[PDB]
Design a protein around this ligand. Structure first.
Ligand SMILES: NC(=O)C1=CN([C@@H]2O[C@H](COP(=O)(O)OP(=O)(O)OC[C@H]3O[C@@H](n4cnc5c(N)ncnc54)[C@H](O)[C@@H]3O)[C@@H](O)[C@H]2O)C=CC1
Ligand SMILES: Cc1cc2nc3c(=O)[nH]c(=O)nc-3n(C[C@H](O)[C@H](O)[C@H](O)COP(=O)(O)O)c2cc1C
Ligand code: SF4
Ligand code: FES
Lengths: 430, 85, 213
């Protein structure tokens, strides 16, 4: 296949994305969830891991690590410590609101994914770390978890398979850095959400010092559908090493901002024009698109014409796929002000642990705050570039990368607008 | 640790008293500033024996090799968990 | 905006705070979610439980959470100052949180911030003098396609206009409770000009399940 997109409703994993059907167990079982879960759990961890590896599922958090290879790190004999699945439900990324819809409208799909993934990795329980601002979503998920315990689907003798598996929900308390996996693990343990240094990866030392897999809501919730429908089914979508469906959150300067499920390597222009109603003022009014939420570098309208919304094509477009959150910015946008608000976000959401993020994200925000007004000189642009290169790769977690990348994308695609901003400041203030 | 790489020879500190005019540190010891540098212990011993100085030698104290592990900060059941980080 | 504490007569370690007994049963339910030997893992919910009983956290709720969980009080002070939900000052009864990051700023959340300011007569960070409304300005609340949105104490109010948020503030001042959703025509997150997806009925149990299963 060469052209991607135009996904059919029979090939959706997240039916009831919009709340138009019943989210409870009577609705979820009538849509295909909790069907033959016992026969999945009895075929062993190796079969489930082989279905996830065969499907080519990559991590829907945004790094795109291979999900089967990641989950197979737990497939090892125990040493007295329990093992845990931990479902990353924080979703603090600006642009991204898909996991909110998964938890809120397909909760039993997430709970069944917790059971299937925890059987795949030998996990004792599931800790779903939901964002604390998602209070109604957390109570929604707890009602679905109570319905799953009252039906014997999880807990003691889960789905009649002889496997014991709990599902816990831990609420956050307002930190974007608690979506990073080791900082999330610290946040469950009753601490400041400060990321750990890797190694140890959480498959060695995770939550409470146990073996732990932290995985996104989407990459957990699609796993029972991958186990039922098959690995080849999910791998038949998108490009190669770009397998499956993906939730997209098209927000910003589009006519109809929405969450929509779509095949993996769909064109960005086709996605915005088809599911979002197109850019406000037309496609000629498009100035920039942040492809995958705030941490990905923006790409301008010349790149957005032919770009495909999977991992490798956006890597070739010197950005990332990320959370697949499409932030559309038209020609009426002060783009320096938008990227500087984004760097302001990244210094309010930064845990202050290591030196390059704690100091340089504040220093980038001060330089960007002067770039908004133009109160600078052009030699400070490349300087700011170097500051970003002193943060990228020198930090503990990737929030330094996620704060250095928008600065780099803005400089790389809009250096002339920065320079004309600063020179008009100079000619009207001296 | 770059000041702990060589052997030094010094002498016993003698009397320093207060200058009656200015309060400066008056001394009468000529050897009060004589610090010598030696590559090994035996060069220092040989230099002191050659000069007729009664000497005493303190052996080099190295720090013993510690056992470090970043993962030990987050043990499942040991007391070595950090309460914060 | 201070991350040190000074003992005021309304915030000191002798400020009266204790849990209700039903809050103690909820605390026991929270503590039994975590393994034995890791009771400190219940610091974040229980302290938030102390924020739900009281509305804010004096330094008697932090010390009570430190006492009932056998953790040092500094390790609770760290969690209370690290996380942005824990009110270390008494906020009003309705805590309005206006998201002003880039996907909400593009869809004109500044107009709603100004509308709440001129409707409540206060500005960002301040409290209305009847102690009913606290207006602050928060980061991305994760409702980006429903921009521009606010949060009132648990509830997301989404797809807002100035008239919509004035209506919400009016029926908060009237004692009622508004409906937590989008204030435009749509329901949760669909394309507003009709469904571009999921128009077919869902297929049900057994559809596409592979052989050998
Ligand atoms: N989903 C969301 O809401 C958000 C997602 N992100 C995305 O998160 C990404 C950065 O997150 P990270 O997990 O810190 O980066 P990534 O480099 O490390 O790793 C992704 C996953 O692979 C695992 N992994 C990677 N290499 C491994 C190895 N050699 N051995 C064992 N496990 C290994 C990690 O443990 C992790 O679970 C970015 O791509 C960013 O776009 C960022 C912010 C919000
Ligand atoms: C600063 C930062 C914040 C993150 N926030 C989230 C998040 O909110 N939700 C999420 O699922 N992943 C988040 N991630 C990615 C996680 O580190 C982790 O890779 C992911 O949750 C699970 O891996 P997976 O994508 O392979 O499933 C964040 C990463 C960083 C660096
Ligand atoms: S780079 Fe920033 S987000 Fe990461 S450990 Fe350091 S302070 Fe924390
Ligand atoms: S940007 Fe305001 S909710 Fe995400």
């Amino acid at each position: 296949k060469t052209s991607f997109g135009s996904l059919k409703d029979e090939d959706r994993i997240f039916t009831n994305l919009y709340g138009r059907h019943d989210w409870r167990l009577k609705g979820a079982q009538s849509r295909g969830d909790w069907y033959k879960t016992k026969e999945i759990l009895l075929k062993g961890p190796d079969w489930i891991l082989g279905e996830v590896k065969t499907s080519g599922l990559r991590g829907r958090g945004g790094a795109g690590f291979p999900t089967g290879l990641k989950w197979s790190f737990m497939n090892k004999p125990s040493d007295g410590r329990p093992k845990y699945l931990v479902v990353n439900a924080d979703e603090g990324e600006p642009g991204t609101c898909k996991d909110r819809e998964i938890i809120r409208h397909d909760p039993h799909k997430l709970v069944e994914g917790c059971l299937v993934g925890g059987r795949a990795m030998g996990a004792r329980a599931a800790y779903i770390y939901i964002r604390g601002e998602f209070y109604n979503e957390a109570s929604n998920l707890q009602v679905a978890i109570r319905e799953a315990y009252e039906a014997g689907l999880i807990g003691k003798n889960a789905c009649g398979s002889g496997y014991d598996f709990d599902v816990f929900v831990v609420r956050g308390a307002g930190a974007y850095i608690c979506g990073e996996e080791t900082a999330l693990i610290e946040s469950i343990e009753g601490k400041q959400g400060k990321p750990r240094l890797k190694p140890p990866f959480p498959a060695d030392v995770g939550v409470f010092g146990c073996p732990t897999t932290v995985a996104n809501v989407e990459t957990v919730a699609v796993s029972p559908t991958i186990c039922r429908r098959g690995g080849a089914w999910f791998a038949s979508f998108g490009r190669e090493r770009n397998s499956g469906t993906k939730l997209f959150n098209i927000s910003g300067h589009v006519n109809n901002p929405c969450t929509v499920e779509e095949e993996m390597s769909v064109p960005l222009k086709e996605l915005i024009e088809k599911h979002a109603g197109g850019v406000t003022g037309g496609w000629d009014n498009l100035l920039a698109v942040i492809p995958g939420g705030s941490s990905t570098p923006l790409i301008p309208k010349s790149v957005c014409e032919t770009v495909l919304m999977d991992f490798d094509a956006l890597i070739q477009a010197q950005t990332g796929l990320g959370t697949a959150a499409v932030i559309v910015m038209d020609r009426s946008t002060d783009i320096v002000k938008a990227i500087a608000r984004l760097i302001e976000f990244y210094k309010h959401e930064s845990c202050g642990q290591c030196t390059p993020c704690r100091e340089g994200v504040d220093w980038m925000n001060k330089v960007m705050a002067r770039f908004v007004r133009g109160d600078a000189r052009p030699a400070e642009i490349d300087s700011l570039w170097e500051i970003s290169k002193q943060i990228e790769g020198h930090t503990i977690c990737a929030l330094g990368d996620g704060a250095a990348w928008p600065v780099q994308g803005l400089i790389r695609h809009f250096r002339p607008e920065l320079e004309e901003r600063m020179q008009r400041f100079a000619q009207q203030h001296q | 640790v770059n000041n702990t790489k060589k052997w030094k020879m010094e002498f016993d500190t003698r009397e320093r008293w207060e200058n009656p005019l200015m309060g400066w540190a008056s001394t009468a010891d000529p050897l009060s500033n004589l610090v010598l540098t030696f590559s090994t212990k035996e060069d220092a011993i040989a230099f002191a024996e050659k000069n007729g100085w009664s000497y005493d030698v303190e052996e080099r104290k190295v720090p013993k090799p510690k056992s470090k592990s970043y993962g030990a900060n987050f043990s499942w059941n040991k007391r070595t968990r950090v309460s914060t980080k | 905006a201070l991350f040190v504490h000074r003992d005021t007569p309304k915030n000191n370690p002798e400020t009266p705070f204790d849990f209700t007994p039903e809050n103690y049963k909820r605390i026991e339910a929270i503590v039994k979610n975590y393994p034995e030997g890791h009771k400190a893992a219940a610091v974040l919910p229980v302290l938030d439980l102390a924020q739900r009983q009281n509305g804010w956290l004096p330094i008697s709720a932090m010390n009570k959470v430190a006492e009932i969980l056998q953790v040092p009080p500094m390790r609770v002070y760290e969690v209370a100052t690290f996380y942005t939900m824990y009110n270390r000052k008494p906020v009003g009864k309705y805590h309005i949180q206006v998201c002003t990051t880039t996907p909400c700023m593009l869809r004109n959340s500044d107009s709603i911030l100004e509308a709440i300011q001129k409707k409540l007569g206060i500005k960002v960070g301040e409290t209305t003098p009847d102690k009913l409304f606290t207006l602050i300005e928060v980061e991305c609340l994760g409702a980006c396609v429903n921009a521009p949105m606010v949060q009132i104490n648990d509830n997301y109010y989404e797809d807002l206009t100035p008239k919509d948020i004035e209506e919400i503030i009016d029926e908060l001042k009237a004692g009622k409770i508004p409906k937590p959703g989008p204030r435009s025509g749509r329901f949760s997150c669909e394309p507003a000009g009709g469904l571009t997806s999921l128009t077919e009925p869902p297929k049900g149990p057994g559809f596409g399940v592979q052989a050998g299963l």
